Design a binder for this molecule. Structure first.
Ligand SMILES: CCCCCCCCCCCCCCCCCC(=O)OC[C@H](COP(=O)(O)OCCN)OC(=O)CCCCCCCCCCCCCCCCC
Ligand SMILES: CCCCCCCCCCCCCCCCCC(=O)OC[C@H](COP(=O)(O)OCCN)OC(=O)CCCCCCCCCCCCCCCCC
Ligand SMILES: CCCCCCCCCCCCCCCCCC(=O)OC[C@H](COP(=O)(O)OCCN)OC(=O)CCCCCCCCCCCCCCCCC
Ligand SMILES: CCCCCCCCCCCCCCCCCC(=O)OC[C@H](COP(=O)(O)OCCN)OC(=O)CCCCCCCCCCCCCCCCC
Ligand SMILES: CCCCCCCCCCCCCCCCCC(=O)OC[C@H](COP(=O)(O)OCCN)OC(=O)CCCCCCCCCCCCCCCCC
Ligand SMILES: CCCCCCCCCCCCCCCCCC(=O)OC[C@H](COP(=O)(O)OCCN)OC(=O)CCCCCCCCCCCCCCCCC
Ligand SMILES: CC(C)CCC[C@@H](C)[C@H]1CC[C@H]2[C@@H]3CC=C4C[C@@H](O)CC[C@]4(C)[C@H]3CC[C@]12C
Ligand SMILES: CC(C)CCC[C@@H](C)[C@H]1CC[C@H]2[C@@H]3CC=C4C[C@@H](O)CC[C@]4(C)[C@H]3CC[C@]12C
Ligand SMILES: CC(C)CCC[C@@H](C)[C@H]1CC[C@H]2[C@@H]3CC=C4C[C@@H](O)CC[C@]4(C)[C@H]3CC[C@]12C
Ligand SMILES: CC(C)CCC[C@@H](C)[C@H]1CC[C@H]2[C@@H]3CC=C4C[C@@H](O)CC[C@]4(C)[C@H]3CC[C@]12C
Ligand SMILES: CC(C)CCC[C@@H](C)[C@H]1CC[C@H]2[C@@H]3CC=C4C[C@@H](O)CC[C@]4(C)[C@H]3CC[C@]12C
Ligand SMILES: CC(C)CCC[C@@H](C)[C@H]1CC[C@H]2[C@@H]3CC=C4C[C@@H](O)CC[C@]4(C)[C@H]3CC[C@]12C
Ligand SMILES: CC(C)CCC[C@@H](C)[C@H]1CC[C@H]2[C@@H]3CC=C4C[C@@H](O)CC[C@]4(C)[C@H]3CC[C@]12C
Ligand SMILES: CC(C)CCC[C@@H](C)[C@H]1CC[C@H]2[C@@H]3CC=C4C[C@@H](O)CC[C@]4(C)[C@H]3CC[C@]12C
Ligand SMILES: CC(C)CCC[C@@H](C)[C@H]1CC[C@H]2[C@@H]3CC=C4C[C@@H](O)CC[C@]4(C)[C@H]3CC[C@]12C
Ligand SMILES: CC(C)CCC[C@@H](C)[C@H]1CC[C@H]2[C@@H]3CC=C4C[C@@H](O)CC[C@]4(C)[C@H]3CC[C@]12C
Ligand SMILES: CCCCC/C=C/C/C=C\C/C=C/C/C=C/CCCC(=O)O
Ligand SMILES: CCCCC/C=C/C/C=C\C/C=C/C/C=C/CCCC(=O)O
Lengths: 401, 401
């Protein structure tokens, strides 16, 4: 727990201040300097993934600070080398720098500083730089942590063939909460391949109010696939865990919890096709999808409140509807977090598990865009208590002890 | 030399980043969003004093860092309590915060966010806040250092009646290099009292290209008074030092050095009045002014290079045209600083000691505005070697040892 250098604290302060001013400038430019004849929704859908990644990195820095101060040893749990472990200052600085780049790209999208370069180049340059920064081979910027994250991502995207650790499970869960990023990446790819209108100088902001492009639609059904990998990876990891340990519990229950998302998205997409093609069983599909909903949310919610966090423990005693041992300084944190998980555990499904693979509401874009940050916030608060439960009493039996 | 808290490093980083982004926005607004039918010069003259104060505080933070790392003990020299001495982080943070306020006021002047609030309120608001922050009685923001600076300013503005310390002499010299701030304050007062055009919504940016207002003119001659005040304070302090010690040297020589400014500005204003009224001795007055110039610059320059810094010492030996003892890590610093002092010692005179009390050139405003930051930079570099000389071998005999 060596203190971070004063230079990196200055750097994170600098990046956070630049981010604040650029954000205020971006908000002011959006409200003042804009023209209401073309749909801004493609831009929002392109940049929502980047914004969610920035927010996730910032909240993960907050999580690392909370873990360090509370007492939960995330270094041992994650199986990291104690010498080069990232303090919360480094995560804050990375989040701030990538937020600087995101704000600059969005500003360039709002008004084109250079008339020669087309406005659709900016979203692509931002994510290209993000990928190159993540895949940078030269040992210059956070090389140890970056390479460790690359190994972890490789292991999590090839889940069945690798023995699971806590890092793999944890990153798979984070991906499960970050499905919006994958869906936005798929939307970016489809939009640039079909509907971008490369020739047009303002192609990414088309005039047609009617969204006839199939990119926001789901005719091919690949959108369900790209939305469903984040749960499929966890399902396969749970199956591999059971195959390795030959324990029906708690791995098949978890696999069922993660496979509820399969039926969720399935029936959502079938409802989308059935209603947009004008069939007589659209109401039946909607009712069956609602039926698989509620079970999906309650399954995930009870899992979060009982096994992920360890709360509602019988032997709590003085603590009410909590665990016997608590490491966070204030007991009200758990009580507020339970209500937060309850409220955001029904919202997250409604907003991005659905409503983005089916076009039931017109305001679905607004709901998804406004609730995905609360999805990442729910994941951020879930991280605190899952890691705290891991430190106190081993869950999932990742550790030998 | 206790390290500054990580929170204050984050704060100075935040303020510096906000300052950088606000400065870039200000430059872009000036070059893009402006109207070329009114004189921007009143705004420049109002805000130049604030900018010079921000730059002086930032460069003084740099000076404090250099003093701490080099070895020169500024705490003992200034006679400060070692417990509550300001590290360079605090000076950097104060400079950054006041720069945030200056940038916000300038931005509000460029475009009026509130049509109800007249645009001439913003610089008045900024300078009123600066004064209130300096004279804040509540022990909230840097109360110890602020009250110490208030006592020092009171002592320096009542120079003859107080025994001089190093702090009083040092602040008097800083004022001598910051005469532009006093001149800008006087211009602000005169402009608001006569030429502001309170009724006009854009009074501080008048349409008339011809600057017929007497504020930029010197009919009353009070501008020369407020410009000679910083040198008058040092002259009176040196006279008081001689009266206290009864040593003709080195106090009467210094008093004459500071008195050269009196004749400088005298003959400058006399040339202004003589040329703007059409008399036959304007050339004679110009020649007398220029004659007293060169002597003033060389007097101050030789003083700086011989007694202030202690350079050109006979016993230097291996060091060429330097002193026998040096505490700064690189010897090239002194050699570059000598040339810098010479060039800026002529430049500062020719730019602000004149050309702001007489209207000889039309581009005089540009020259003064572009060279006053070099006057604060020259003072910043002079601070390093004056304090280093004070630490090495007592100059001025402020200390008993
Ligand atoms: C109008 C347009 C929109 C405007 C807003 C745009 C985005 C806003 C983003 C603001 C920036 C947030 C991140 C900046 C916080 C960085 C904190 C930091 O580095 O502080 C240093 C502090 C001291 O460290 P110490 O505890 O001494 O030990 C360190 C061990 N080496 O170390 C610590 O980190 C410990 C103390 C802080 C712990 C984390 C808490 C910081 C985040 C709090 C919430 C931030 C804002 C959230 C949303 C605001 C709106 C509701
Ligand atoms: C160094 C670290 C910190 C970085 C700080 C960056 C600060 C940026 C602050 C932006 C604030 C903008 C302020 C604008 C003031 C008013 C300007 C205006 O109204 O016009 C905008 C101008 C249009 O000009 P025009 O219409 O010809 O003139 C109109 C006459 N009134 O439009 C223009 O031509 C200029 C618009 C300003 C351009 C700002 C954004 C630049 C983006 C550059 C490329 C970004 C892409 C990089 C992607 C990286 C990916 C990793
Ligand atoms: C294709 C779709 C992708 C969807 C999103 C996928 C990425 C999710 C976010 C990345 C994961 C965040 C960090 C995960 C670990 C956090 C826990 C932690 O504190 O780990 C500390 C770890 C220590 O590293 P260290 O000690 O150096 O390693 C051992 C040394 N031999 O150090 C770390 O924390 C390592 C973190 C590495 C640096 C942060 C990530 C860099 C930026 C990522 C940009 C991704 C670009 C995606 C573009 C598409 C967006 C639409
Ligand atoms: C386009 C429009 C205009 C854009 C520009 C607008 C204005 C630019 C202003 C930039 C901000 C400058 C000030 C920020 C520097 C702050 C440095 C800082 O706090 O760093 C922490 C560093 C570490 O401290 P340490 O030595 O470990 O010991 C401390 C003891 N407690 O502690 C230290 O301070 C030591 C290391 C640094 C020492 C001071 C050097 C900093 C200043 C260098 C020059 C800055 C820019 C000058 C002009 C640039 C253009 C030519
Ligand atoms: C919190 C810490 C950090 C603080 C960060 C502050 C961020 C400020 C960033 C400013 C960037 C401005 C970006 C402007 C984008 C383009 C806007 C534009 O072109 O119009 C400006 C707008 C005029 O609007 P209008 O002409 O009606 O509409 C034109 C239609 N295209 O004009 C307007 O009406 C709005 C112009 C923007 C106003 C910015 C400055 C606000 C100043 C508030 C008061 C300041 C005084 C405080 C003094 C304190 C003294 C101690
Ligand atoms: C009317 C025309 C005025 C013209 C300009 C006059 C002001 C010049 C600039 C102010 C002087 C700068 C600082 C001088 C000392 C620097 C040397 C140093 O390092 O001092 C450390 C000192 C320690 O303080 P401490 O230890 O707390 O005191 C003993 C505790 N019992 O701590 C300090 O450094 C104390 C510094 C106090 C905080 C900085 C100043 C606050 C901002 C000043 C705003 C002035 C507003 C002027 C408005 C008009 C502009 C046109
Ligand atoms: C009611 C809902 C919508 C909002 C309330 C939940 C939020 C604000 C709560 C829930 C859990 C809380 C966190 C729980 C534990 C930690 C670690 C501790 O060392 C500092 C506080 C910190 C970082 C808390 C911050 C606030 C927090 C994130
Ligand atoms: C993951 C990060 C890098 C963002 C994804 C951007 C990249 C992979 C995508 C976005 C736009 C895409 C291009 C869009 C259109 C075409 C034209 C088609 O006839 C061949 C493929 C090609 C040339 C695509 C290649 C891949 C591409 C460049
Ligand atoms: C939306 C819902 C209804 C979809 C169906 C998924 C759920 C209900 C199913 C899928 C796989 C199932 C599990 C398969 C195997 C076993 C092992 C046994 O020892 C306990 C029950 C348990 C753990 C089952 C519980 C129910 C389960 C988790
Ligand atoms: C194999 C089990 C464990 C997981 C299944 C998850 C994936 C493969 C499922 C879940 C949702 C499914 C989609 C639901 C709806 C559509 C639209 C329809 O017009 C064609 C099939 C298609 C495109 C399905 C393809 C397969 C799909 C994406
Ligand atoms: C939503 C409903 C209708 C269907 C799915 C919920 C049921 C089948 C499952 C989902 C998660 C399950 C819980 C998961 C973990 C535990 C902890 C264990 O020590 C006691 C049983 C208990 C508390 C399980 C009880 C049954 C449970 C609540
Ligand atoms: C040729 C002219 C115009 C410009 C050159 C002069 C400038 C760049 C030089 C002259 C004196 C120099 C300073 C002298 C001493 C110190 C203290 C040391 O611990 C760090 C470097 C630092 C802070 C130097 C920075 C650069 C400096 C300010
Ligand atoms: C030193 C800091 C506070 C900046 C100086 C600003 C203050 C002191 C100045 C600037 C503008 C000035 C005002 C300008 C005009 C008038 C009208 C006159 O008939 C009476 C004085 C009065 C009302 C002045 C009072 C002093 C004043 C408010
Ligand atoms: C621009 C110039 C010419 C203006 C005149 C000011 C200078 C030259 C004058 C003013 C007062 C003078 C000083 C008055 C008294 C003495 C004391 C004596 O023991 C040594 C000479 C010395 C120290 C004089 C040197 C010259 C002096 C400094
Ligand atoms: C007394 C000695 C030590 C220092 C003298 C410095 C001051 C008081 C001097 C130096 C420059 C002088 C000014 C120079 C020129 C003008 C313009 C003229 O039309 C009237 C006199 C007037 C306004 C002078 C007033 C007094 C003045 C300001
Ligand atoms: C510009 C000219 C024409 C007039 C003013 C310069 C003359 C009179 C003065 C101004 C400053 C003076 C110097 C100030 C300090 C010292 C240090 C001492 O140990 C030797 C003499 C020496 C080096 C002085 C020599 C004379 C000097 C150079
Ligand atoms: C923690 C919560 C964070 C919330 C962050 C919010 C992000 C974006 C918010 C709202 C999205 C609204 C966009 C306005 C656009 C409307 C489309 C109509 C115009 C048209 O059809 O042309
Ligand atoms: C270390 C050096 C720092 C320099 C910082 C620079 C500051 C300001 C620079 C230049 C001032 C130029 C202003 C342009 C205005 C011209 C007046 C003509 C227009 C009119 O008559 O309407």
């Amino acid at each position: 727990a060596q203190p971070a250098p004063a230079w990196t604290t200055f750097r994170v302060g600098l990046f956070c201040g630049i981010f604040i001013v650029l954000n205020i400038t971006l908000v002011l430019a959006a409200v003042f300097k804009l023209e209401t004849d073309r749909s801004i929704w493609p831009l929002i859908r392109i940049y929502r993934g980047g914004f969610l990644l920035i927010e996730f990195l910032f909240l993960l820095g907050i999580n690392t600070y909370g873990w360090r101060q509370a007492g939960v040893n995330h270094v041992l749990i994650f199986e990291l080398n104690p010498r080069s472990n990232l303090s919360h200052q480094h995560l804050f600085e990375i989040a701030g720098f990538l937020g600087i780049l995101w704000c600059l790209s969005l500003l360039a999208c709002f008004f084109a500083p250079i008339s020669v370069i087309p406005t659709y180049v900016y979203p692509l340059a931002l994510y290209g730089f993000m990928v190159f920064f993540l895949i940078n081979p030269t040992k210059t910027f956070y090389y140890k942590s970056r390479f460790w994250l690359l190994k972890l991502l490789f292991r999590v995207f090839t889940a069945p063939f690798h023995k699971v650790g806590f890092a793999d499970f944890w990153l798979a869960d984070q991906l499960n909460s970050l499905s919006v990023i994958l869906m936005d990446l798929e939307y970016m790819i489809c939009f640039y391949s079909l509907e971008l209108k490369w020739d047009e100088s303002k192609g990414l902001l088309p005039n047609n109010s009617e969204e006839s492009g199939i990119c926001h639609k789901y005719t091919y059904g690949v959108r369900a696939i790209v939305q469903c990998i984040p749960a499929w990876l966890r399902f396969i990891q749970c199956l591999r865990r059971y195959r390795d340990t030959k324990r029906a519990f708690p791995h098949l229950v978890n696999a069922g919890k993660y496979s509820t998302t399969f039926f969720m998205v399935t029936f959502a997409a079938l409802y989308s096709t059935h209603k947009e093609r004008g069939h007589s069983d659209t109401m039946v599909f909607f009712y069956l999808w609602i039926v698989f909903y509620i079970i999906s949310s309650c399954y995930t919610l009870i899992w979060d409140l009982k096994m992920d966090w360890g709360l509602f423990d019988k032997n709590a005693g003085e603590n009410t509807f909590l665990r016997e041992e608590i490491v966070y300084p204030q007991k009200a944190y758990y009580y507020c977090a339970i209500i937060e998980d309850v409220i955001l555990r029904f919202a997250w499904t409604i907003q991005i598990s659905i409503t983005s693979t089916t076009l039931l509401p017109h305001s679905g874009d607004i709901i998804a865009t406004v609730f995905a940050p609360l999805e990442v916030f729910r994941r951020f608060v879930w991280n605190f208590f899952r890691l705290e439960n891991e430190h106190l009493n081993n869950c999932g039996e990742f550790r030998a002890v």
